[PDB]
Amino acid sequence: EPQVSVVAAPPHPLLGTALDLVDATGQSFTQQLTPGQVAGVFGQQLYG
Amino acid sequence: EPQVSVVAAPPHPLLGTALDLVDATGQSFTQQLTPGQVAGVFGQQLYG
């Protein structure tokens, strides 16, 4: 591994990775949440 | 597991994954090739 490294902070968990799609007029981002993650992020319940 | 009927063919190796950016006017795709894959796909050498 290189001895040099950046701080590599994690993405804000609702927007995820930014796309660098070439001809884009404005930036866009995507995330997948697994069944394990969803119950950790969706911290409120309505009627269960 | 769900019923195994879910499975489908792999992506064409350098065309990769089709995106679904919502308001896109025509489809786009991306691939990452890691170094061991690069030597597998780039089957010609010029001057080494």
User: 3-class secondary structure for B3-48?
Assistant: CHHHCCCCCCCCCCEECCCCCCCCCCEECCCCHHHHHHHCCCCCCC
Burial, A13: exposed, middle or buried (Cβ in 10 Å; 0-12, 13-18, 19+)?
Answer: exposed
Q: Structure solved using which method?
A: cryo-EM
Cross-strand bridge partners of residue A29: A18
Q: CB-side exposure of B7: number of CA atoms within 13 Å?
A: 3
List the structure tokens of B29: 């795709």
DSSP code of residue A8: -
Residues counted in chain B: 48
Which residues, 6+ apart, have CB-to-CB distance to B38 below 8 Å?
Answer: none
Put simply, the answer to whether A28 touches B21 (Cβ < 8 Å) is: yes
Entry resolution (Å): 3.4
Residue of B nearest to A27 (CA): B21
> What residues of chain A lie within 8 A of the CB of B21, using their CB?
19, 21, 28
Size of interface A-B (CB pairs under 8 A): 6
List the structure tokens of B44: 């010609």
Residues counted in chain A: 48
Considering only CA atoms, give the Rg of chain B.
16
Interface of A with B (CB under 8 A): 19, 21, 28
* Dihedral pair phi/psi, residue B35, rounded to 5°: -55, -40
Contact call for residues B8 and B17 (beta carbons, < 8 A): no
Considering only CA atoms, give the Rg of chain A.
16
What is the least distance, in Å, from the CA of A8 to any CA of chain B?
Answer: 19
At residue A37, the 3 state secondary structure works out as helix
**Amino acid identity, residue B19?**
L
